Amino acid sequence: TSQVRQNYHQDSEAAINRQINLELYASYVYLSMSYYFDRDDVALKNFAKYFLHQSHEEREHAEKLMKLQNQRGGRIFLQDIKKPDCDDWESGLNAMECALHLEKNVNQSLLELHKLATDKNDPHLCDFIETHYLNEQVKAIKELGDHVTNLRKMGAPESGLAEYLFDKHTLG
């Protein structure tokens, strides 16, 4: 057994390991979305600059979860990481919608983990998710909603001039 473990139910460690798997999955999905745009036949270098970031942040999310899990003293049982859903995103707008959908899945999983931590009377895990992960995901979902709305109002995916000006001005 451990020696620092105190008031830490096993279902908590289960949901933590699930969340670590989901975060590494998200980092791998953003890596694929980033180097999809680096091809010649798309050629949106500032989209690749943006999507190469927001994978390192989710990597830091996974590493912060693992540091938290080794603080409370469990183990880290980690499964495989699965390939992403799609590869040819067909535009830059539809990739923003898929990133939006992925961030809403991550938010839903964090709300389920917070309800699990509330049911088990673990105030430290509730405080950890309140301090670190909820506010950042709300800001990220709002930012992706802003970008989706800008690219929808500019008339994309009809004329890629909208994609070009949006790539140069907003994400530059």
Binding site: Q10, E13, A14, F77, Q79, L116
Partner: protein, 632 residues
């Protein structure tokens, strides 16, 4: 009195002049999507059902109010976890969105062994022992409750059920479904006296082992830790594995707690002209865990449209029903038709004298091509005269394409609504289904929506037209004709099929040294009763004491094929052709299949009790068809 094919034209012109998909879209509206039992919107939907039955100027609608105990999840939600011994700790693989209803709120941990479906023969093909271990299976071709009973048979403590890609063509690898596993039909939580004491039930189908649904992606994450190749016999994906590793196992936690709810079965009766008390039962499941386009978007819709067309033929044109018509919209049907059973516990043997046909509006619209029938045999030839003059929707040909339709009838399972009427209360019942080789992909999921249902079948109005046409011709054939279109001569083939099972196995009977003369005497009594009833029909009138009495004697023939030799509280299934239990005939067939080997599972005194009670049941029913004592 009017003329018959003119009334057929009336039915055919009110079927083509009624929109059908609008009610299915209306139940899928944003104010009505969660209609699970005990909720606010389910009561609002029952109010809408009452409103729609009040809109057509009927005779009387009311509520059938009951106060029932169901089991709904707590704040704590279900968990499926991969546990490993060597590092002592865990991994959550799924907190599922759906749940198996009425499972034991406990926590089990065991080695996971994969089976095909969860049947007996698929357990007897395994490599690995089952006792004290959790078995993961696939849904298909049986119920959830038969999986739970098979796991109870071999000391298994948990069942995990996943939807595959091959059988169920769903792109969503994370969609969770809904299930119920009552070993029997009704409320398993039945110490049914009102009161604060806590008595056990012990005779109402309690699953004493946990069981919980899982999705497909979490199933693949489970197979990632499992070893042993699945057979090519089971027709699966490339993902499949058999048994977990040496020190790894699977932990299941189900957290469902009690809830005292009210169920309100909405009843609507329409009178007739001549015969006031007898009727055809037209019922429909109504609630849904999810949206329920096919699970609720079909039964309630066809119920309301049949109410519309029958109120039109009563009020506008002057159709004359011989007897009354009912329309029942049921609550708590997703759990295994609990409300229907609790309605039939008060109506066990005091309803078959009046109500004589259940028509199954539930799961009638599921596909396009195949028209499959599972029914009580008295209805069969009626169905035959239904299949010859109703159009196929897309092909355009006739429905009566196969003259071998009555012998290859797939039997009714536990999870259907016509089977409690067939096996518990003794009312003849019919279930007709438009479907294909693949099952309906969204039975109990959150994607049973109007969009996918109208997208797969563009002629959903036409498929519902054909289903409502065979249902309306059922109603008009049974409620305007001077006779009943019920075939007692298919039961000749049924009892002769039982004697055919005995004639091939007579060497095992002559090992026991029996002269079976009273059994053939009972079969001769049955045959002479059918011949003399046919001769009496050769001298029976039409529009006249004797006629209703002959009709009720024809109605009673399904009721006499129940077993009066057992108690219903110990065994609610008493029908020897379709039901379940040791006193029934398939149990005798399997117990005689146990006789061909020297296995200790063969209980010989119990088999003799089965054979004696079966012969006495054949004698009693064959004498009950005779009626008066002169007819021997």
């Amino acid at each position: 009195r009017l003329y018959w094919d003119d009334l057929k034209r009336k039915l055919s012109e009110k079927l083509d002049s009624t929109d059908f998909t609008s009610t299915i879209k209306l139940l899928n509206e944003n104010s009505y999507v969660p209609r699970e039992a005990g909720s606010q919107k389910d009561e609002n939907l029952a109010l809408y059902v009452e409103n729609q039955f009040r809109e057509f100027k009927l005779s009387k609608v009311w509520r059938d109010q009951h106060f029932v105990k169901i089991q709904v999840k707590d704040s704590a939600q279900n968990s499926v976890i991969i546990v490993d011994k060597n590092g002592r700790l865990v991994y959550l693989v799924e907190n599922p969105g759906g749940y198996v209803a009425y499972s034991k709120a406990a926590t089990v941990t065991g080695k996971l062994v994969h089976a095909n479906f969860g049947t007996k023969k698929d357990f007897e093909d395994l490599y690995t022992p089952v006792n004290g271990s959790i078995v993961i299976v696939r849904a298909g071709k049986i119920t959830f409750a038969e999986k739970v009973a098979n796991a109870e048979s071999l000391n298994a403590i948990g069942v995990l059920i996943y939807m595959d890609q091959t059988k169920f063509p769903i792109v969503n690898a994370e969609l969770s479904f809904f299930g119920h596993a009552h070993l029997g039909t009704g409320d398993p939580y039945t110490p049914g006296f009102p009161s604060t004491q806590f008595p056990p039930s012990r005779s109402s189908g309690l699953p004493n082992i946990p069981v919980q649904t899982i999705s497909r992606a979490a199933a693949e994450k489970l197979f990632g830790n499992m070893e042993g190749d699945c057979p090519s016999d089971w027709k699966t994906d490339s993902t499949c594995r058999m048994v977990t590793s040496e020190s790894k196992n699977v932990k299941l936690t189900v957290s469902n707690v009690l809830k005292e709810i009210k169920i309100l079965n909405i009843f609507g009766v329409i009178k007739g002209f001549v015969e006031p008390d007898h009727y055809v039962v037209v019922g429909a499941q109504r609630d849904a865990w999810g949206p329920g386009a096919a699970k609720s978007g079909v039964g309630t819709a066809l119920l309301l449209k049949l109410a519309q067309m029958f109120s039109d033929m009563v009020l506008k044109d002057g159709f004359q029903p011989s007897r009354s018509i009912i329309f029942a919209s049921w609550s708590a049907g997703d759990f295994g038709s609990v409300g229907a059973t609790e309605w039939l516990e008060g109506y066990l043997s005091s309803l078959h004298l009046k109500a004589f046909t259940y028509i199954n509006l539930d799961k009638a619209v599921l596909g396009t091509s195949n028209f499959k029938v599972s029914a009580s045999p008295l209805l069969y030839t009626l169905i035959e005269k239904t299949m010859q003059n109703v159009k196929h929707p897309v092909t355009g040909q006739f429905l009566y394409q196969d003259s071998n339709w009555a012998s290859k009838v797939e039997k009714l399972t536990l999870d259907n609504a016509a089977f409690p009427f067939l096996a518990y209360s003794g009312i003849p019942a019919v279930s007709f289904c438009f479907c294909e080789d693949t099952d309906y992909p969204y039975l109990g999921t959150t994607m049973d929506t109007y969009k996918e249902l109208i997208e797969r079948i563009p002629e959903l109005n036409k498929v519902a037209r054909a289903a409502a046409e065979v249902a309306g011709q059922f109603v008009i054939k049974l409620t305007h004709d001077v006779e009943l279109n019920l075939d007692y001569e298919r039961y000749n083939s049924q009892l002769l099929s039982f004697v055919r099972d005995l004639n091939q196995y007579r060497a095992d009977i002559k090992e026991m040294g029996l002269s079976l003369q009273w059994l053939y005497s009972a079969r001769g009594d049955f045959f002479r009763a059918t011949s003399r009833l046919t001769t009496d029909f050769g001298n029976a009138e039409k529009t006249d004491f004797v006629m209703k009495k002959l009709n009720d004697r024809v109605m009673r023939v399904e009721y006499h094929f129940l077993s009066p030799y057992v108690s219903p509280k110990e065994s609610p299934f008493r029908h020897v052709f379709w039901g379940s239990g040791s006193h029934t005939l398939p149990a005798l067939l399997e117990n005689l299949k146990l006789r061909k080997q020297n296995n200790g599972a063969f209980n010989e005194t119990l088999f003799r009790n089965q054979l004696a009670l079966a012969t006495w049941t054949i004698q009693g029913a064959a004498n009950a068809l005779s009626g008066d004592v002169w007819d021997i």
